[PDB]
């Protein structure tokens, strides 16, 4: 149920600019070309995360990204709490 | 008559974005491959839920999914009320 | 003459998507297997309803199905008026 | 001569889908069992209508059937004109 | 010679379905019971026409039937041409 | 005179399929072997029924057979009318 | 020797269906009643042909009949060749 | 009288598709070769079943077949009722 | 004894369609005219095989025909086994 | 007495088609020419079998022929029972 | 032998759609009227082609037809190989 | 050989959507009523065009139809080239 | 030839959104029910126009509809030119 | 023709944001659930307006809504002029 | 009784798409040519499997086919249970 | 068993867009005309692959196609694993 | 194999906005009407390039288009490298 | 090729505000309503301009507009150079 956390409590609590920043930061880690960089959305990004990051469905890397963003530090802590719960 | 709740008062009220959300979230619990991710519509998704979630026709898991969606919290409460009525 | 209403003023007025909805929702009430889900058309479905719903030829159950569909509320009212007439 | 109109200008102008639908709608009025619904063609259906509807060879009930069919409304009017002619 | 036209250029140019339809339409005009409806072939039907339609051996009524058959309109014209030839 | 009804207005009105059907259904009641069931025509069948069914010359059992055959229900009614006439 | 062509190379080559065609078409030309049309075989038909058609033993009319039969056009040509030989 | 039911109420009430399926499913129990599989009709199939299933004229096995046929479950129940009547 | 195989295990096991192919493909080898092509039945055809194929009563050519028919390949193998037995 | 079984319980129980089968298959064993093939009836065939098959009056070979006929296997068993009876 | 290729490896390998296409394309070359287009099966069609195309029993024209059908190009090549073999 | 081009390089190369468009556009020129519009396939449509457009078997009119279709301009040019070749 | 203009130069040039607009605006003038709005494609919509708008096959009303759509003003002018030509 | 004004001169002159505002303001008056808020386009909205606002096809309420929006006051005046014209 | 499971509980439950899948996948294992792929229905396919897969009447290979189909996994499990029962 | 992999683990896991890509890229390698582009489904496409790519049943070319599609890289690896297994 | 480059390394790497730009720029060189401007996706557009730009399947013109797009200069260089490779 | 210059070297280089001023200044010359003021992007604007400014695809008036903008004077000179080149 790691995809539930990364999709509901993750990419869908942050705004569009932060989602674009997350996509750009994980473009190399998900092999996102030009089309996927601007066309893919939160559902498709989470599905690709699960497909390529089966260990934790990309929750760890999402938390690491959210740590560096000052606006999303609280959300990173919440995601850490969710991961500890599950 | 649970599938009449998950299909009429459930997947149909939600827009296409939230339906894709649900399909992605329930992909592991419904064994949806790449084709079923984008091809199956609400009728076939509800039928597959009834086939694989015979205990509650997927209504409980749909309500749990809708709880974490800020937009569909009211719909989750309505589905809870419908389930209690049935 | 109840099958006349449920066929010509019923399934024949709704599109293929709503017809698939009706076939799925009445699957338990008509014992439709996988083949009947994707092969039976409006004529066969109406005949099967009349066979298994001899009390009202499935017109009433179709009416409750159409009530929950926001698009077919007017058709549900029309079917109610037709049932009252006959 | 009524059977000439109900066959040549009737069942033989409408397609197979409408022919099956007519056969279903007249199953109770013609006592068609499972074999007759899926086996009888337009010739034998017209003959049975003439046998069991000697008043008008089934032309009138065919016209009332065609009235509710939006596609065959023009053919219903043509059948009315033919009946008025004869 | 009129029986030559109705049997050679007539009932034997049309297929079995059209021959059955002709037999059904002329059932009242030839007093065909159940047996003769599906047992008499083209030879016996033409003989019965000549027996009961001695004015024209049924050629006129066969042409009238063929006129309403869109598939056999050309054959109706050919039969008319042959009749005016003889 | 019951032979006249059962032959002229009976077996001679039904087609070959229904005659073979009657022969099969009356095989036990007429002790028809392999040769008789396949080779005997309507005349010999009526004569044998008169010989073995002297109470009503087989008219009652033929009517009972014709009752259950939907194509021959009208002929069964006609045979009943003939029986009450005679 | 005209009987040999019309019989051995004529009616004895066509099947029973085409022979019944020939018997029916020449019923007026041979004065064949109900029994003669349905009982006479090819030998007696050829004998009656010679009896009533002394000019050519019925070969010319048989060829004319075979001309209009599409299946027997080759046989008609063969009969023409035999007549030219004789 | 068991054959009197399996023919009127059985193989003839079902369509040709179901009759062929019945013939295939009873091929081993009736020793039907290649010819008899698609040459034997309902009358001959019923006669063969009565010959080889003298205990119940094949009514029990026909009911067992009809049961697993979703379309013919009602006919199976009717056959059970008729057997109990006999 | 070879006629016992070509008839009982040969033409009498195949249906009417396969028998018509057999009669057809052997028209040149059996000098079958228009009449014999659709009049001769299995007994007469087998007798003609024995008359004109004294070497093996036509069993070899029948097996060769059955080889190219995919439906009757098993029957061809059975005929080969019977020939090796005798 | 063996002639009684082969005639009364034998050839006279099978139909004309199977009788022609028997005549053709026994043509070599009975020296049946062209005339005897389609002129000798069951009485004459049984008499010739008794004249030529004095060991068992042809009962054994008739049973062997009936074994290969799927329709007459039951009659072959009956003839075997009669032979062991006598 | 050219019939063997055109029938067993020819019209009988293609489905009913392609067979109707062939009958249609050969209607002018075989003089098939309205009846023969919708009634003639593969046996009678092949016999007619041999009768009218004695040079190669219509194998060349069938191969030319099959060339233009993309689905039957492999079958056309196989027929060419068979023709070169024979 | 004009029907060969219109059926092979014509209607068979275009998809079902374009075939339905062609059938609709030629409905007035072919007198296609309601049944033929949704029932006739490419083989029967080509035969009807040849019957009613004997000057060019409908190839020219098909070319003019294909000219206005942007997808089938290349096929229209190919059909023009084929017509110039023949 | 007005339907050739309204279809090829009309509905087939506009995209799906404008086609749905044409269907919706002409719903009252064509009596399109709920099914017909979401099911009928350009071929069937044009055929229905020609059936119900025999004066100009619906070209005038299509042009009037296209006038108010800013995107399709050029197509409206082109259709006006086509109508003036025809 | 009120649907023509509300669609072509109405929702299609306003941009996407104003259309969303119109949909949100008429959510209660049209019973639009969450799916219809974000999925229904101008064609579907106009059709629903005609279905539920048959008095003026929603033109009056659309004009009232446009009055409150300063950007669309000119469009509201134009729609008033169009309503006065029709 | 293995053919009972593979037919009634097997191919008759799947829709036409999955049946075509089964026919294509078993083409090499059943030697189905071009005609057999597009013409055989469930009855004749089941008969062919029983003929060629005598070890398990094709039930095992059908189960392995149904395993890889995500839609028919439940049907594969049901067929496994049926095989274990028998 | 290569066609099993290319169908069940190949085209049946990818959606309609990827399947249209597949058919498109291999149009030259499969000689798919305009009809085959939009009509052939996965079963017919896989059958044509096996017919024209007997070396690997089209599995290898499908793998090279899936390699270039970023969404189907995992499925390409799975197909490579399946090929290595078989 | 140039369609593979223009489709996989080309139009599918670019986002939807750049694909619309490419469709616009190649509209004159591909004769794209109003429908194809907004309806044709990447598969259809690449196929149209192959049909109309057989020299290089439109790869050269696509590269020229990508040169003027600052975002897609790297993709233009990659396409040049692919063309040099193939 | 004037559209390539106006779209790539023109509207694609200027930012959003300059493009909005270009759309506002060209609104009268392009007949853009309220929706087209904001919704239309550079691709659609360039298309429209080609449609209505066929003399130079809008390059001349775009250059004239860019002349008055001090920021885009260099781009205006570059567009003049491109026009002179082409």
Author numbering:
A (entry chain R), B (entry chain N), C (entry chain J), D (entry chain D), E (entry chain H), F (entry chain P), ...: 4 to 89
Reproduce, without paraphrasing, sentences from the article in which this PDB structure was first reported.
Interferon-inducible protein 16 (IFI16) is a member of absent-in-melanoma-2 (AIM2)-like receptors (ALRs), which contain a PYD and one or two nucleic acid-binding HIN200 domains (hematopoietic interferon-inducible nuclear antigen with 200 a.a.). IFI16 acts as a versatile innate immune sensor that detects dysregulated nucleic acids, with its most prominent mechanism of action being assembling filaments on unchromatinized double-stranded (ds)DNA. Upon assembly, IFI16 mediates a wide range of innate immune responses such as accentuating cGAS-STING-dependent interferon signaling pathways, viral replication restriction (e.g., herpes simplex viruses, cytomegalovirus, and human papilloma virus), and even chromatin dynamics regulation during DNA damage responses.
We present here a cryogenic electron microscopy (cryo-EM) structure of the IFI16PYD filament at 3.3 Å, which shows a helical architecture distinct from inflammasome PYD filaments. After extensive optimization, we identified conditions that allow recombinant IFI16PYD to auto-assemble into filaments. The average power spectrum from cryo-EM images of 256-pixel-long nonoverlapping filament segments showed that the IFI16PYD filament is a three-start helix with 134.6° rotation and 5.6 Å rise, displaying no rotational symmetry. Our structure shows that the assembly is mediated by the six interfaces that are commonly found in PYDs and CARDs (Types 1-3 ref.). The Type 1a:1b interface is composed of polar and hydrophobic residues, and Type 2a:2b and Type 3a:3b interfaces include mostly polar and ionic side-chain interactions as predicted previously. Notably, unlike the inflammasome filaments assembled by ASCPYD and its interacting partners, such as AIM2PYD, the IFI16PYD filament lacks the C3 symmetry and displays vastly different helical parameters. Moreover, instead of the six protomers that constitute the filament base of ASCPYD, the base of the IFI16PYD filament is composed of five protomers (i.e., hexagon vs. skewed pentagon). As a consequence, the diameters of both outer and inner rims of the IFI16PYD filament are smaller than those of the ASCPYD filament. For instance, compared to ASCPYD, the short helix 3 that mediates the Type 3 interface protrudes from the center of the protein by ~ 6 Å in IFI16PYD (dotted red circle in Fig. 2Dc). In addition, the loop between helices 5 and 6 in the Type 2 interface also extends from the core by ~ 5 Å due to Pro73 that shortens the helix 5 and lengthens the helix 6 (dotted red circle in Fig. 2Dc). These differences in IFI16PYD would then clash with the ASCPYD-like assembly in the Type 3 and Type 2 interfaces, also causing the Type 1 interface to misalign (red arrow).
